[PDB]
């Protein structure tokens, strides 16, 4: 029996007309929906999923360079030029150097020097955008007691009709709540690891980055963040890569929480919805059975739940099944008027075998009352006291 | 008999003492020196020669070039530089050229261009300096009648003692006259030809030239006079030699007079000297002969010379030789009182054979007189009239 121990549980009742009922859904929460002559079905909102995230930025933390070259010129011979400076893939550096007779120049002065190297990224990390169009809410609806359907709902597709076997179907219509969802974070990935990071911090990471997804060939920006050029030779300049920066990010990610992405879809926790659900086509069993006639027995003694309700487990020692279960509460007993109400509304034992067990959940009135199971002389009762008031 | 028909003839007489006699010597002239009881010897100054001329300037009229190269630069790439521009042997040219995308530059602008070529001279012409130390005067002294010595005299060696066989020696002391010699000309040579040129015109010849003699390797100046640089492409420039210029000088040398240099010495015409000549050791034959006794005969009738003197040729039909010739002039003919004077002073017939001929030159007095040859009854006479007065 579901939603029994859920702390964040809600009880919604049905209108006089009997179609519109409003609910609000929390992740890690439940809503018990009761309506007049209706199966009393539980809605959960169990899973929030994101998928198909458009990539915003991709930062590189491990670089490599090749074909390094330099060009020099004596004073009064102009600026140095290598074919590679206008090439966007290469990172360059231009400076003046003291030239003279000792370096192969006919005079002593500052000469032009340029040095370039092709920058390639060996290992990159990726940031992805989390927008409403990427969301996927998995909501499970279950007959409180084939009889539990799961549905998935998009913000671009709010509706879904959950089908329950003999009970018809429930029609979910929802809309995304404003303020209780994410927009200020990105889905940072890093060598099959995954995190959630403040996108504001994300834009200020001192590493090379390109602005699109992996288009044609990525044009990296701020290549000097990993590549520095060592002081100054007269005709050369030495270029060095910093190497792997994975440890720097793993330590910059101190408080970040991890996620799980067993495929292309990313799992995480929270979620908040609001839903009008249509029960016009929800029915209790289209066949009216007779009552179970044999003796019942309390296996689990009545036990109070967090919300004031009580749960009872019986085992019906008869074969009449499928028969309705005679279950009510009574303050008179002589005889025999119902008080309170059942949560497991219209209990039915479909089991045709001998010693079928069944759990019930009753909503006792305040004060004293008797839980009554069975019909005839061999019926069972159990006192129950509930405290509090309106 | 020398100096007989010379138009520029001079007659110098002897002092009472008999050692010092002044003369002035013209090229193409003669000086007859008569002294008391002396051989009466003729000085000429026949030749003026120059030698060992220090070369002043050497011009080139035929050039050739090799290893031509160029260096270029796009705008903002500095000045062009080839190793051979600081090399003095090469002639270079530096200019700007329109550069652009069509010439292999990322810019449109004026680019530096230099072009150099090695200049070598195939054939040169030379100018030589004519200074007093280069002079050489050849003076010939001859007994008027072994008996003619030639002497050479330098301005750095003014003296020379001419040796005549039986007559002793004449001592020449001279000094170069001031103003009647050359200094404003050079000895221009050109492919074994030779000229005299005004050095002022020589310093303005538009051709390559070096300033010394052929030292180490000649450094030529004004190489652009033969080497012009034709129009300049973006990366190249064409260099061209004019070729031989010999005809240009042969036509610029319109009025120049040629010389002759059969060896390292160059002989030419003019010359002027002045000399004291010492006749203390000049003697008439140290033996006193007797008079010729046989008959004389006039072969050449007495003929007047340009200077009023007269010449007579006799043939002595006697064997007395060596005998002194009786020759005088007389106006009385009862007595043989000498009048005028002999120029062929103290004539001697050294010939011992039968019909020896001899030429005499007499200096007749003004008016009438008789040329008297011989001594005795068979002596010959010839009337002679000379016109003019003191």
């Amino acid at each position, epitope marked *: 029996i579901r939603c029994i121990g859920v702390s964040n549980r809600d009880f919604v009742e049905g209108m006089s007309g009997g179609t519109w009922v409003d609910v609000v859904l929390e992740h890690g929460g439940c809503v018990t929906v009761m309506a007049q002559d209706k199966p009393t079905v539980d809605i959960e909102l169990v899973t929030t999923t994101v998928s198909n995230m458009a990539e915003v930025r991709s930062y590189c933390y491990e670089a490599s360079i090749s074909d390094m070259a330099s060009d020099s010129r004596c004073p*009064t011979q102009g600026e140095a030029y290598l074919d590679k400076q206008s090439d966007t893939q290469y990172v360059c550096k231009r400076t003046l150097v003291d030239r003279g007779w000792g370096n192969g120049c*006919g*005079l*002593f*002065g500052k000469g032009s020097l340029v040095t370039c190297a092709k920058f390639a990224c060996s290992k990159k990390m990726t940031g992805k955008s989390i927008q409403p169009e990427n969301l996927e809410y998995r909501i499970m609806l279950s007959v409180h007691g084939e009889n539990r359907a799961k549905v998935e709902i998009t913000p671009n597709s709010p509706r879904a009709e959950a089908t329950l076997g003999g009970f018809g179907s429930l029609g979910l219509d929802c809309e995304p709540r404003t303020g209780l969802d994410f927009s200020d974070l990105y889905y940072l990935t890093m060598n099959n690891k995954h995190w959630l990071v403040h996108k504001e911090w994300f834009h200020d990471i001192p590493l090379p980055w390109h602005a699109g997804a992996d288009t044609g060939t990525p044009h990296w920006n701020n290549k000097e963040a990993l590549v520095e050029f060592k002081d100054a030779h007269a005709k050369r300049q030495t270029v060095v890569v910093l190497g792997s920066q994975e440890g720097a990010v793993h330590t910059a990610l101190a408080g970040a929480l991890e996620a799980e992405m067993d495929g292309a879809k990313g799992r995480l926790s929270s979620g908040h919805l609001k839903c009008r659900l249509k029960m016009d086509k929800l029915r209790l069993k289209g066949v009216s059975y007779s009552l179970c006639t044999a003796a019942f027995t309390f296996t689990k003694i009545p036990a109070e739940t967090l919300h004031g309700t009580v749960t009872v487990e019986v085992q019906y020692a008869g074969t009449d099944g499928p028969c309705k279960v005679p279950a009510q509460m009574a303050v008179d007993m002589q005889t025999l008027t119902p008080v309170g109400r059942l949560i497991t509304a219209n209990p039915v034992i479909t089991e045709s075998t001998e010693n079928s067990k069944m759990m019930l959940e009753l909503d006792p009135p305040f004060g004293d009352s008797y839980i009554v199971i069975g019909v005839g002389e061999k019926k069972i009762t159990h006192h129950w006291h509930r405290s509090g008031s309106t | 008999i020398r100096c007989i028909g010379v138009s520029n003839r001079d007659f110098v007489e002897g002092m009472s003492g008999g050692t010092w006699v002044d003369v002035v010597l013209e090229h193409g002239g003669c000086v007859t020196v008569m002294a008391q009881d002396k051989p009466t010897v003729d000085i000429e100054l026949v030749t003026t020669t120059v030698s060992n001329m220090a070369e002043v300037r050497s011009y080139c009229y035929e050039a050739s070039i090799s290893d031509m190269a160029s260096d270029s630069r796009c705008p903002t790439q500095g000045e062009a*530089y080839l190793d051979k521009q600081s090399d003095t042997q090469y002639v270079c040219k530096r200019t700007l050229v329109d550069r652009g995308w069509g010439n292999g530059c990322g810019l449109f602008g004026k680019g530096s261009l230099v072009t150099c070529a090695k200049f070598a001279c195939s054939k040169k012409m030379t100018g030589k300096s004519i200074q007093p130390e280069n002079l050489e005067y050849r003076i010939m002294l001859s007994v008027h009648g072994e008996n003619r010595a030639k002497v050479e005299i330098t301005p750095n060696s003014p003296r020379a003692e001419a040796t005549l066989g039986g007559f002793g020696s004449l001592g020449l002391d001279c000094e170069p006259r001031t103003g009647l010699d050359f200094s404003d000309l050079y000895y221009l040579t050109m492919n074994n030809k030779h000229w005299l040129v005004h050095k002022e015109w020589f310093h303005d010849i538009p051709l390559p030239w070096h300033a010394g003699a052929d030292t180490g390797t000649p450094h030529w100046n004004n190489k652009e006079a033969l080497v012009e640089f034709k129009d300049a492409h973006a990366k190249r420039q064409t260099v061209v030699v004019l070729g031989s210029q010999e005809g240009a000088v042969h036509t610029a040398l319109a009025g120049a007079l040629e010389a002759e240099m059969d060896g390292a010495k160059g002989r030419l015409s003019s010359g002027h000297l002045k000399c004291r000549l010492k006749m203390d050791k000049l003697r008439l034959k140290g033996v006193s002969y007797s008079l010729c006794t046989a008959a004389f005969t006039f072969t050449k009738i007495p003929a007047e010379t340009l200077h009023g003197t007269v010449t007579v040729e006799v043939q002595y039909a006697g064997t007395d030789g060596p005998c002194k010739v009786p020759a005088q002039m007389a106006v009385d003919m009862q007595t043989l009182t000498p009048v005028g004077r002999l120029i062929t002073a103290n004539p001697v017939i050294t010939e011992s054979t039968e019909n020896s001929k001899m030429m005499l030159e007499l200096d007749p007095p003004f008016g009438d007189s008789y040329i008297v040859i011989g001594v005795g009854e068979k002596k010959i006479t010839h009337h002679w009239h000379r016109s003019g007065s003191t």
Partner: antibody
Amino acid sequence: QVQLQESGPGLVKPSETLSLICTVSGGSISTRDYYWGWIRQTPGKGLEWIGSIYYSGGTYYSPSLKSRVTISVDTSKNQFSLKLRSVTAADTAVYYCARQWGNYFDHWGQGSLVTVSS
Amino acid sequence: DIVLTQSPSFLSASVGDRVTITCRASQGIDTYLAWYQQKPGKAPKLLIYGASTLQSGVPSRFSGSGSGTEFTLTISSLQPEDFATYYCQQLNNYHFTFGPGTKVDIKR
């Protein structure tokens, strides 16, 4: 304060070799920052550079005199030497030794007059 | 080689005047140019290097400016000891070469 002093003013015969020594005071010669040069001056009054040399020994000569010039260093005695050969009357001049601070001559010597005649 | 030119050649000024001397290189030497001072019977004295830097111990009167090919040495408030001929000097292609010199006489 570096001081430079060329060897005494001297007389040289034509076609013989001119030999000068300038000795450095007030500072080192085995230093990496400076060069060490020779500069002439004919009377009236042009300055001509002859050549410079490194304490290591590396020479740099004018192309107009390269074939006649030889410059040497003696780091142990803090001096350097100029040698011109095949001297003529055109080489009569005052010869200066100078410290070259890479592109300029920051310190000079008093100068030594060399006269060339027989 | 680069042949430097200097203007004017001679000039007579008077104490207190401001004198300007110009130097011209055929090729771009950007700022690698010097000015020297040579009094009679003495060695040159480096005044300016780098075409605008004053050398230590040189009076504030002297200054230099220029880039490329045309450089200018300026003498504020000329003094009677400033008698000298001034030379510009540049180095290029392992070759030192000096200017022709600007003689500066004093008028009083």
